[PDB]
Design a protein around this motif. Structure first.
Motif, PDB file in Angstrom:
ATOM      1  N   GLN A 178     -17.175  19.960 -25.710  1.00 43.67           N
ATOM      2  CA  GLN A 178     -16.624  21.286 -26.125  1.00 43.67           C
ATOM      3  C   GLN A 178     -16.425  22.169 -24.884  1.00 43.67           C
ATOM      4  OE1 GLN A 178     -20.152  21.640 -29.116  1.00 43.67           O
ATOM      5  NE2 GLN A 178     -19.722  20.206 -27.445  1.00 43.67           N
ATOM      6  N   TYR A 179     -17.308  22.053 -23.892  1.00 50.05           N
ATOM      7  CA  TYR A 179     -17.279  22.890 -22.670  1.00 50.05           C
ATOM      8  C   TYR A 179     -15.976  22.639 -21.906  1.00 50.05           C
ATOM      9  CZ  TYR A 179     -18.501  24.888 -18.138  1.00 50.05           C
ATOM     10  OH  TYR A 179     -18.512  25.568 -16.955  1.00 50.05           O
ATOM     11  N   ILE A 180     -15.572  21.368 -21.792  1.00 49.61           N
ATOM     12  CA  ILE A 180     -14.330  20.955 -21.073  1.00 49.61           C
ATOM     13  C   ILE A 180     -13.119  21.263 -21.974  1.00 49.61           C
ATOM     14  CG2 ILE A 180     -13.141  19.010 -19.972  1.00 49.61           C
ATOM     15  CD1 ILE A 180     -15.827  17.912 -19.106  1.00 49.61           C
ATOM     16  N   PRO A 198     -16.954  22.538 -10.231  1.00 41.60           N
ATOM     17  CA  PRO A 198     -18.019  21.541 -10.176  1.00 41.60           C
ATOM     18  C   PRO A 198     -18.769  21.337 -11.503  1.00 41.60           C
ATOM     19  CG  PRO A 198     -18.150  23.056  -8.296  1.00 41.60           C
ATOM     20  CD  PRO A 198     -17.128  23.619  -9.255  1.00 41.60           C
ATOM     21  N   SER A 199     -18.846  22.366 -12.361  1.00 45.44           N
ATOM     22  CA  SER A 199     -19.526  22.291 -13.678  1.00 45.44           C
ATOM     23  C   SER A 199     -18.857  21.186 -14.491  1.00 45.44           C
ATOM     24  CB  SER A 199     -19.528  23.622 -14.421  1.00 45.44           C
ATOM     25  OG  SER A 199     -18.225  24.019 -14.820  1.00 45.44           O
ATOM     26  N   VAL A 200     -17.528  21.168 -14.475  1.00 38.04           N
ATOM     27  CA  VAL A 200     -16.703  20.184 -15.229  1.00 38.04           C
ATOM     28  C   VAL A 200     -16.938  18.781 -14.657  1.00 38.04           C
ATOM     29  CG1 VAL A 200     -14.329  19.487 -15.740  1.00 38.04           C
ATOM     30  CG2 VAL A 200     -14.999  21.891 -15.958  1.00 38.04           C
ATOM     31  N   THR A 202     -19.295  17.456 -12.726  1.00 35.58           N
ATOM     32  CA  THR A 202     -20.695  16.978 -12.880  1.00 35.58           C
ATOM     33  C   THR A 202     -20.966  16.580 -14.336  1.00 35.58           C
ATOM     34  OG1 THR A 202     -21.442  18.014 -10.914  1.00 35.58           O
ATOM     35  CG2 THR A 202     -23.143  17.558 -12.529  1.00 35.58           C
ATOM     36  N   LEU A 203     -20.482  17.329 -15.320  1.00 38.06           N
ATOM     37  CA  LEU A 203     -20.597  16.948 -16.752  1.00 38.06           C
ATOM     38  C   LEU A 203     -19.899  15.599 -16.957  1.00 38.06           C
ATOM     39  CD1 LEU A 203     -20.102  20.270 -18.784  1.00 38.06           C
ATOM     40  CD2 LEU A 203     -22.145  18.825 -18.694  1.00 38.06           C
ATOM     41  N   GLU A 204     -18.657  15.461 -16.479  1.00 34.20           N
ATOM     42  CA  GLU A 204     -17.909  14.178 -16.557  1.00 34.20           C
ATOM     43  C   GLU A 204     -18.783  13.060 -15.977  1.00 34.20           C
ATOM     44  OE1 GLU A 204     -14.290  14.952 -14.453  1.00 34.20           O
ATOM     45  OE2 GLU A 204     -13.496  16.229 -16.039  1.00 34.20           O
ATOM     46  N   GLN A 227     -29.941  16.669 -13.580  1.00 32.53           N
ATOM     47  CA  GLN A 227     -29.428  17.762 -12.712  1.00 32.53           C
ATOM     48  C   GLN A 227     -27.942  17.962 -13.009  1.00 32.53           C
ATOM     49  OE1 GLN A 227     -28.604  17.674  -8.208  1.00 32.53           O
ATOM     50  NE2 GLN A 227     -30.627  18.623  -8.374  1.00 32.53           N
ATOM     51  N   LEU A 228     -27.526  19.190 -13.332  1.00 34.38           N
ATOM     52  CA  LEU A 228     -26.095  19.543 -13.526  1.00 34.38           C
ATOM     53  C   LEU A 228     -25.716  20.674 -12.570  1.00 34.38           C
ATOM     54  CD1 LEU A 228     -26.044  19.307 -17.414  1.00 34.38           C
ATOM     55  CD2 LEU A 228     -25.175  17.653 -15.769  1.00 34.38           C
ATOM     56  N   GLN A 229     -24.443  21.080 -12.572  1.00 34.35           N
ATOM     57  CA  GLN A 229     -23.945  22.188 -11.720  1.00 34.35           C
ATOM     58  C   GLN A 229     -23.371  23.319 -12.577  1.00 34.35           C
ATOM     59  OE1 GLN A 229     -22.195  21.165  -7.556  1.00 34.35           O
ATOM     60  NE2 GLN A 229     -21.583  19.578  -8.998  1.00 34.35           N
ATOM     61  N   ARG A 230     -23.531  24.544 -12.095  1.00 35.37           N
ATOM     62  CA  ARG A 230     -22.865  25.757 -12.625  1.00 35.37           C
ATOM     63  C   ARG A 230     -21.448  25.809 -12.063  1.00 35.37           C
ATOM     64  NH1 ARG A 230     -27.891  27.518 -11.161  1.00 35.37           N
ATOM     65  NH2 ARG A 230     -29.242  27.996 -12.943  1.00 35.37           N
ATOM     66  N   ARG A 231     -20.633  26.748 -12.551  1.00 43.36           N
ATOM     67  CA  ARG A 231     -19.232  26.929 -12.085  1.00 43.36           C
ATOM     68  C   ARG A 231     -19.199  27.130 -10.568  1.00 43.36           C
ATOM     69  NH1 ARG A 231     -15.440  27.948 -16.743  1.00 43.36           N
ATOM     70  NH2 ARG A 231     -16.802  28.307 -18.541  1.00 43.36           N
ATOM     71  N   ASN A 232     -20.219  27.775  -9.987  1.00 47.15           N
ATOM     72  CA  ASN A 232     -20.238  28.141  -8.546  1.00 47.15           C
ATOM     73  C   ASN A 232     -20.806  26.997  -7.701  1.00 47.15           C
ATOM     74  OD1 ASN A 232     -22.998  28.398  -9.061  1.00 47.15           O
ATOM     75  ND2 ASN A 232     -23.044  30.611  -8.788  1.00 47.15           N
ATOM     76  N   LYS A 235     -27.000  24.067  -8.443  1.00 49.63           N
ATOM     77  CA  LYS A 235     -27.606  22.946  -9.212  1.00 49.63           C
ATOM     78  C   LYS A 235     -28.758  23.491 -10.071  1.00 49.63           C
ATOM     79  CE  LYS A 235     -26.181  19.501  -5.823  1.00 49.63           C
ATOM     80  NZ  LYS A 235     -26.617  18.556  -4.775  1.00 49.63           N
ATOM     81  N   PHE A 236     -28.926  22.936 -11.263  1.00 47.64           N
ATOM     82  CA  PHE A 236     -30.057  23.225 -12.175  1.00 47.64           C
ATOM     83  C   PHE A 236     -30.358  21.958 -12.968  1.00 47.64           C
ATOM     84  CE2 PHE A 236     -28.103  23.610 -16.396  1.00 47.64           C
ATOM     85  CZ  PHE A 236     -26.768  23.640 -16.067  1.00 47.64           C
ATOM     86  N   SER A 237     -31.571  21.848 -13.507  1.00 50.32           N
ATOM     87  CA  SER A 237     -31.998  20.665 -14.295  1.00 50.32           C
ATOM     88  C   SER A 237     -32.099  21.034 -15.771  1.00 50.32           C
ATOM     89  CB  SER A 237     -33.271  20.092 -13.764  1.00 50.32           C
ATOM     90  OG  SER A 237     -33.005  19.442 -12.537  1.00 50.32           O
ATOM     91  N   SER A 242     -31.477  20.964 -26.617  1.00 50.72           N
ATOM     92  CA  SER A 242     -31.027  22.218 -27.283  1.00 50.72           C
ATOM     93  C   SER A 242     -29.980  22.935 -26.411  1.00 50.72           C
ATOM     94  CB  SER A 242     -32.183  23.099 -27.676  1.00 50.72           C
ATOM     95  OG  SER A 242     -32.980  23.394 -26.552  1.00 50.72           O
ATOM     96  N   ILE A 243     -30.184  23.023 -25.094  1.00 52.11           N
ATOM     97  CA  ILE A 243     -29.279  23.764 -24.165  1.00 52.11           C
ATOM     98  C   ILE A 243     -27.883  23.112 -24.138  1.00 52.11           C
ATOM     99  CG2 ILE A 243     -29.902  22.512 -22.050  1.00 52.11           C
ATOM    100  CD1 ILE A 243     -29.916  25.291 -20.644  1.00 52.11           C
ATOM    101  N   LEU A 244     -27.775  21.845 -24.531  1.00 52.30           N
ATOM    102  CA  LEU A 244     -26.520  21.064 -24.405  1.00 52.30           C
ATOM    103  C   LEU A 244     -25.746  21.094 -25.710  1.00 52.30           C
ATOM    104  CD1 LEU A 244     -27.986  18.062 -22.416  1.00 52.30           C
ATOM    105  CD2 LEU A 244     -26.320  19.716 -21.560  1.00 52.30           C
TER     106      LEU A 244
END
Ligand code: ZJ4
Ligand code: ZN
Ligand code: ZN
Length: 257
Positions: A178-180, A198-200, A202-204, A227-232, A235-237, A242-244
């Motif tokens: 849904q995010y992409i 990078p958010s896109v 890294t999700l891929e 570990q994923l990435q924010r738009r900027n 990095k965060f884990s 639930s967050i996904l």
């Protein structure tokens, strides 16, 4: 016959793209198999060949049409048809090679590329990374023309590789996340063409690992963090499904409920 979903770049709206991605998700899975509130794609084991694929017919302003074949077990593009020619990515094994013989069976000309359809291979052939390839209605229109003209020698291999990266992200990755889907909706809303942040990417890159982490979770808590990435690019884990739930729409089947 495999189900066909139609999309056109000619007059594409937030609404037409929304209906398209929801129809794709609806044909990829029944949504009968849900783990921690995220739907699972059908198990390859027990899936009859007459249910293995869906067809996405793409048209552009030039009224050129190409049909992509998606594998319902992982939503990935395995090949396409442009008029009297079909092209397939190198299958990973014998079962997959035999499966693709069931696609486009009446097409006059059939070709299997020696190379696979993974981002690493397609970026190498394109001579460009995903972070330098623009996505949006303009890029998809150009990708459709490039795919169409490959069989008549009008498209060079790097251009075909780049066109595949565009189609895969705007269809397969949008169906999976849904995010992409939302990133592509925004580009349509604002008549924008731009490379994925990078958010896109890294999700891929993390889709298979996230499917595993969610399905193997102890009541939603991950056995190990991802570990994923924010738009900027920060990095965060993630430790928890639930967050996904607003981020991931589909998972590859990993194990029984
Ligand atoms: C909240 C979340 C969970 C898992 C994966 C991702 C990419 C996200 C983000 C949504 C917006 C983000 C931002 O603005 O940088 S990051
Ligand atoms: Zn137009
Ligand atoms: Zn749960």
């Amino acid at each position: 016959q495999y189900p066909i979903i139609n999309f056109t770049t000619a007059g594409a709206t937030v609404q037409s793209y929304t209906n398209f991605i929801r129809a794709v998700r609806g044909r990829l899975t029944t949504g009968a198999d849900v783990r921690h509130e995220i739907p699972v794609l059908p198990n390859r084991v027990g899936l009859p060949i007459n249910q293995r694929f869906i067809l996405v017919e793409l048209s552009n302003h030039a009224e050129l049409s190409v049909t992509l074949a998606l594998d319902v077990t992982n939503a990935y593009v395995v090949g396409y048809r442009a008029g009297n020619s079909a092209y397939f990515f190198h299958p990973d094994n014998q079962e997959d090679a035999e499966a693709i013989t069931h696609l486009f069976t009446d097409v006059q000309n059939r070709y299997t590329f020696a190379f696979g359809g993974n981002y690493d291979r397609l970026e190498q052939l394109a001579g460009n990374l995903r972070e330098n390839i623009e996505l949006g209605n303009g890029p998809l229109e150009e990708a459709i023309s490039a795919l169409y003209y490959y069989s008549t020698g009008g498209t060079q291999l790097p251009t075909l590789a780049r066109s595949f990266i565009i189609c895969i992200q705007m269809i397969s990755e949008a169906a999976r996340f849904q995010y992409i889907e939302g990133e592509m909706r925004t580009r349509i809303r604002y008549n924008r063409r731009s490379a994925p942040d990078p958010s896109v990417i890294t999700l891929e890159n993390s889709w298979g690992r996230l499917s595993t982490a969610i399905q193997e979770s102890n009541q939603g808590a991950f056995a190990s963090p991802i570990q994923l990435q924010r738009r900027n690019g920060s990095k965060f884990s993630v430790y928890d499904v639930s967050i996904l739930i607003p981020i991931i729409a589909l998972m590859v089947y990993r194990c029984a409920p």
